[PDB]
Design a protein around this ligand. Structure first.
Ligand SMILES: CCCCCCCCCCCCCCCCCCCC(=O)O[C@H](COC(=O)CCCCCCCCCCCCCC)COP(=O)(O)OCCN
Ligand SMILES: Nc1ncnc2c1ncn2[C@@H]1O[C@H](COP(=O)(O)OP(=O)(O)OP(=O)(O)O)[C@@H](O)[C@H]1O
Ligand SMILES: Nc1ncnc2c1ncn2[C@@H]1O[C@H](COP(=O)(O)OP(=O)(O)OP(=O)(O)O)[C@@H](O)[C@H]1O
Ligand SMILES: [Mg+2]
Ligand SMILES: [Mg+2]
Length: 1135
């Protein structure tokens, strides 16, 4: 691609014009206008293209007048007049030349208009992503990932369209008055009856633009919420599967898709009426006129009638097709412009020192989120930030980071920030790539980071080392691995100010102090550090400590199978056969109406007072017209019905297939690869493909009509038609960005912290330039074929023109008028037919990409033919018998020979280093991959019942808390199976009631994207609230309180003891104080169960792993734990 067409030279041009308009609007006291910016940018390039229009359009309108001179040779033909035949060969010559001129002008126009659109689309995409990197937290509340995907996927694709047709808004009306002027000299006042139709149709067609834009806007809304819901399914699929919530999301998507389709059906009918107009309007017009002509007392004769029909034919495209499509495309596009505009207008964002600082995350809040803060920290000092869940600790880092601006007071910072976010940010690549983050590789400093971040061991267990591939969100890594990678990245950048948001809570006690001592103290020793932490064990190493409570400071110290499927998915084969019949019936009645004028002309020519019975000729002419109109309407609406019904059916199968795909599918496919189907491809199948099919079907049958008429009038045309057909056969025989966007929006504060924004912009522009080469290669190959197909068509028009004059002794004037009027329409229709063919064939790739996702590999059936009795589980015994587990068949085993019994009502702790396989045990139990060996739950094999039979009966609290966009009520109870008093009881028991009663909607409060209103500790408490509302014998807890402070933890621990007393409970926990009272503790290393015994019995073996683990916490910690273990063990031995 030339530099002038690159995504970063584009985009920067239009951003300049946008900024100028924004700057002028404030001087004008206006609101800015994006249309205006577009115009100012492009106009000089685009208005010139109208020259092509003007030349072509003028050349079309003279051809009928030349046709009148040759028809007027057959009419009153004298075979003596060799001089007249020589002149007639002259006029056929000029038609041959005009045909070639029109052919080159069509390609020159259509190429450039396409390019124009591509430019506009590419420039817009750049500006949208540039804006996304600048959005404030306020703006990120007013928009969502699904909207931005929608913007970049479907809204900007309107820009491809606009540029095509836009010159026809004046060429249409202009042609309509020119043809009328012309017609006046052929048929007199009678032509006025034709203008009487156009002065109706064209204003009606234009005035309908308000419908298109209102329908579009309405549609657009539902696409945003649908794509957003797909995004939170695809990123939430593990938690959705473990909860068995698939049916709730299916109902929600189905209703949004139903609302959305109701507007697509409306619009499609409008669209369909336009293409019916293209077919029938000309027939209406010539009927109206010639009825008037015969009522005023003229008689039908070949030269006047067929020049008039040909005149209409010369305008037909421009007026009847191109003009309405223009209004359509433009009124549709102004919505895209308004959508984009609104986006573009959204809000945009050595020492550390803070003074008098007060700030609000939302100005509607009654209370500040930080109040009267002052502190300062300087090189070599470590400041610990301590306090409850929701106290403001991450808010403090966001104040230093500049993401929460002061309402009063001030902040000043000098030096580069390194930000270690509370949720780890990990993106697709190798784990080496995630650590380097654009810095050069240098072995000595890199290996020092790998050991300092406690990461050397894990990388030696992996087969491909630090070059192992990682998924779009790190879903292939355990929690404490994605934490260590997130910290190792920060160390490698060698920044000046480190902002550490609870980096240690996802790792084991040994790895925790390894990171603190070797990374946070020793490696970063010379640097400013602010450490948000609950690990009170380390605070003695801090230079100063800040305690926050309640927001304030407390203290400081294409195959045919695809085509077959696409049509047959829409309707039963009877409707498809009927649809074929009305297509043929429309085109046959179309031809017979024009043959009837040819026949009427010949009868009038045969007469001598004698006159034709007008009741017969005008009667039959009326019938054939009404027949053509009737089938034209039915044919146009029925195609839209079948193909939208096909898109609706193929979507449902694709979505059902996705919900039954195994989690391995989502680990191996990028999120953007999936959203591309549901956003872009479904968009084309709904909006654009049905229209383009009907347009091709109409024009293709019209082309066949020309060849049929030409051969039927002049049989010897069949001789050259064989070579032309052979050449036609010879030619035919010879002839992701959304994952990057999603990653960028997740990492946005960290990307801004390191000032990586330019490098991220360059990646986006590089990706757009790749798609641009694919677009230019498609255009270049399509043009190469099109310019040769036109050479076949041009020869056909030439041999029918001259063949008429060679064979003239066999012809009659009405017959030549018929054959050549059709021939003159051929090439303009033939060109558009070939264009719409190429776009259909291109868009069928979208259909294949959708069909392949209808046929994904399936996770096992949700209900088998065998089902457990409703009493099951009735004891909650779980037996693991020689279990082995791997997340893929081609991959390593992560659990080996695992063999254990869990008794009824037993409480079991699960313990061991990061990456040991602890959460892998839950994935086996839930059959997220199918285990080897055997697992028995109350004497039923988990593998002999359906995936909802077991998953519904096991409560889970996952390692990652996921909340969904919606009400707080729906996040607790999506099925509406509980009363509000039960939800409030849950919210009291998880210490969260006051935090919800402060919200203005209370439980009807709408949560932001991914639950962003809440701190991470609060999102953990909501997952415990979900699990309290379910009622099951078996509960699984995975690190459910790791981000919850100790004084909140001891309360929810007490409630867990009280509420789940009758359950069998499995608890994975690094925070050993939460599990020291277990009945038995499993200790895992390297995927093996090494110890499984009573807590005190483990600790009295000084060579055990568990004795080492409690001892690593420190002497007072080990004393408290060993005492607690001894006490519970003695109490178990007293009875
Ligand atoms: C013998 C035939 C004689 C008549 C031929 C002309 C037909 C029009 C006659 C005027 C009376 C009929 C109604 C006119 C429109 C009324 C206002 C509603 C417009 C509307 O709903 O649709 C518009 C679509 O474009 C349009 O509707 C565009 C219509 C353009 C008409 C001709 C303009 C000539 C100049 C073109 C210059 C092009 C230069 C290109 C380089 C804009 O949609 P919206 O309102 O929803 O959008 C913003 C949403 N927020
Ligand atoms: N992006 C946000 N938008 C609006 N409110 C927020 C946002 N993030 C946090 N809050 C609110 O600000 C207050 C403090 O949240 P904050 O995240 O600072 O708590 P925290 O100290 O990080 O708790 P944790 O220990 O779980 O990290 C809470 O009331 C929380 O609901
Ligand atoms: N989706 C996955 N696909 C393939 N392998 C995975 C996947 N998730 C985790 N692993 C591998 O599984 C092993 C164990 O991961 P697991 O989550 O069971 O460790 P863990 O005990 O939960 O560590 P943590 O204390 O951080 O929770 C890891 O070493 C990792 O290599
Ligand atoms: Mg926090
Ligand atoms: Mg885990």
């Amino acid at each position: 691609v030339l530099p002038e067409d690159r995504s970063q030279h584009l985009g920067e041009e239009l951003q300049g014009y946008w900024d100028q308009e924004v700057l002028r609007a404030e001087k004008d006291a206006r609101e800015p206008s994006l249309t205006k910016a577009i115009i100012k940018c492009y106009w000089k390039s685009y208005v010139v293209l109208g020259i092509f229009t003007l030349i072509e359009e003028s050349t079309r309108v003279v051809q009928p007048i030349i046709l009148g001179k040759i028809i007027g040779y057959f009419e009153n033909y004298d075979p003596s007049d060799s001089a007249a035949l020589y002149e007639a060969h002259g006029y056929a010559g000029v038609l041959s030349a005009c045909t070639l001129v029109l052919a080159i002008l069509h390609h020159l126009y259509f190429y450039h208009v396409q390019c124009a659109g591509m430019r506009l689309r590419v420039a817009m995409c750049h500006m949208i992503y540039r804006k996304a990197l600048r959005l404030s937290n306020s703006a990120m509340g007013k928009t969502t990932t699904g909207q931005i995907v929608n913007l970049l996927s479907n809204d900007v694709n309107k820009f491809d369209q606009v540029t095509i047709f836009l010159h026809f808004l004046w060429a249409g009306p202009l042609q309509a008055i020119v043809v009328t002027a012309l017609l006046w000299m052929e048929i007199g006042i009678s032509c006025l009856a034709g203008m009487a139709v156009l002065i109706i149709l064209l204003p009606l067609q234009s005035c309908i633009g308000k419908l298109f834009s209102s329908l579009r806007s309405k549609t657009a809304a539902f696409t945003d919420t649908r794509i957003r819901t797909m995004n939170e399914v695809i990123t939430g699929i593990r938690i959705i599967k473990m909860y068995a919530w698939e049916k709730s999301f299916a109902d929600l998507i189905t209703n949004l898709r139903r609302k959305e389709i109701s507007k697509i059906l409306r619009s499609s009918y409008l669209r369909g009426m336009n293409l019916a107009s293209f077919f029938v309007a000309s027939k209406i017009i010539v009927f109206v006129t010639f009825t008037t002509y015969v009522f005023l007392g003229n008689v039908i004769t070949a030269s006047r009638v067929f020049v008039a029909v040909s005149l209409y034919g010369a305008v037909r495209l421009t007026v009847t097709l191109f003009f309405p499509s223009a209004v359509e495309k433009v009124s549709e596009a102004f919505v895209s412009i308004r959508r984009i505009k609104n986006f573009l207008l959204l809000d945009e964002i050595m020492i550390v020192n803070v003074q008098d600082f007060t700030a609000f995350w939302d100005k509607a809040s009654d209370t500040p989120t930080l109040q009267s803060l002052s502190f300062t920290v300087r090189p070599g000092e470590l400041l610990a930030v301590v306090g409850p869940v929701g106290a403001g600790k991450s808010s403090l880092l966001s104040a230093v980071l500049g993401e929460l601006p002061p309402n009063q007071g001030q902040v000043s910072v000098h030096g580069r920030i390194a930000y270690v976010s509370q949720q780890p940010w990990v993106f697709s690549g190798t784990v080496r790539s995630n650590i380097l983050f654009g810095k050069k590789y240098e072995k000595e400093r890199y290996e020092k980071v790998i050991k300092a971040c406690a990461l050397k061991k894990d990388l030696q267990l992996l087969e491909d080392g630090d070059l192992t591939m990682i998924g779009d969100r790190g879903t292939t890594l355990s929690g404490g691995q994605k934490a260590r990678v997130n910290l190792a990245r920060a160390v490698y950048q060698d920044a000046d100010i480190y902002l550490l948001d609870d980096p240690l809570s996802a790792v084991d006690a040994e790895v925790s102090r390894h990171l603190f001592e070797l990374c946070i103290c020793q490696a970063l020793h010379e640097k400013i550090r602010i450490l948000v932490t609950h690990q009170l064990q380390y605070l003695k190493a801090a230079s100063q400590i800040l305690i926050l409570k309640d927001g304030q400071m407390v203290q400081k110290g294409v195959g045919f199978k695809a085509y077959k499927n696409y049509f047959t998915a829409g309707a039963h084969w009877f409707i498809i056969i009927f649809l074929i019949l009305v297509n043929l019936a429309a085109q046959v009645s179309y031809i017979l109406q024009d043959w009837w004028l040819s026949y009427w002309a010949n009868q009038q020519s045969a007469l001598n007072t004698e006159k034709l019975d007008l009741n017969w000729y005008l009667g039959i002419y009326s019938g054939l017209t009404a027949s053509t109109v009737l089938f034209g309407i039915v044919r146009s609406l029925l195609v839209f019905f079948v193909l939208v019904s096909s898109s609706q059916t193929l979507h449902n199968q694709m979505f059902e297939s996705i919900l039954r795909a195994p989690v391995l599918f989502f680990d191996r496919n990028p999120i953007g690869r999936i959203l591309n189907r549901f956003s872009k491809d479904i968009g084309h199948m709904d909006d654009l493909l049905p229209l383009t099919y009907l347009d091709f079907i109409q024009t293709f049958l019209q082309v066949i009509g020309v060849v049929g008429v030409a051969v039927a009038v002049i049989p010897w045309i069949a001789i050259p038609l064989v070579p032309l057909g052979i050449v036609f056969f010879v030619l035919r025989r010879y002839f992701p960005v959304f994952s990057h966007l999603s990653s960028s929006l997740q990492g946005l504060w960290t990307i801004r912290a390191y000032k990586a924004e330019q490098r991220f912009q360059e990646l986006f522009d590089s990706h757009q330039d790749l798609h641009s080469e694919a677009w230019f290669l498609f255009l270049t190959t399509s043009r190469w074929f099109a310019v040769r197909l036109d050479a076949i068509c041009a020869v056909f028009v030439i041999v029918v023109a001259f063949g008429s004059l060679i064979l003239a002794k066999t012809l009659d004037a009405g017959q030549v008028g018929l054959a050549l009027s059709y021939a003159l329409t051929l090439m303009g229709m033939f060109q558009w037919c070939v264009r719409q063919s190429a776009e259909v064939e291109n868009m069928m790739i979208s259909v294949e990409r959708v069909i392949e996702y209808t046929d994904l590999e399936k996770e096992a059936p949700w209900e088998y033919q065998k089902r457990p009795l409703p009493s099951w589980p009735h004891e909650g015994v779980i037996i693991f018998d020689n279990v082995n587990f791997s997340y893929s068949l081609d991959g390593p085993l992560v659990l080996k020979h695992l063999t254990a019994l869990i008794k009824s009502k037993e409480k079991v702790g699960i313990v061991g280093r990061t990456g040991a396989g602890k959460s892998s045990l839950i994935a086996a139990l839930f059959r997220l991959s199918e285990p080897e060996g055997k697992i028995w739950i109350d004497k039923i094999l988990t593998t002999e019942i359906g995936l909802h039979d077991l998953r519904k009966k096991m409560s889970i609290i996952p390692q990652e808390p996921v909340l969904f966009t919606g009400t707080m009520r729906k996040n607790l109870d999506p099925f509406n199976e509980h009363s509000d008093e039960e939800l409030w009881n849950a919210l009291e028991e998880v210490q969260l009631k006051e935090a919800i009663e402060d919200l203005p909607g209370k439980m009807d409060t709408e949560l932001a994207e991914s639950g962003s209103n809440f701190s991470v500790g609060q999102r953990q408490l909501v997952c415990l609230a979900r699990a309290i509302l379910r009622k099951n014998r078996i509960l699984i807890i995975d690190q459910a309180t790791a981000n919850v402070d100790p004084r909140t933890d001891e309360l929810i621990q007490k409630k867990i003891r009280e509420k789940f007393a009758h359950c069998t409970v499995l608890t994975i926990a690094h925070r050993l104080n939460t599990i020291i009272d277990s009945d038995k503790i499993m200790v895992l290393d390297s995927g093996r169960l090494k110890e499984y015994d009573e807590p005190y019995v483990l600790l009295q073996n000084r060579d055990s792993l568990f004795y080492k683990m409690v001892q690593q916490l420190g002497k007072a910690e080990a004393a408290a734990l060993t005492e607690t273990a001894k006490q519970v063990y003695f109490k178990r031995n007293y009875p």
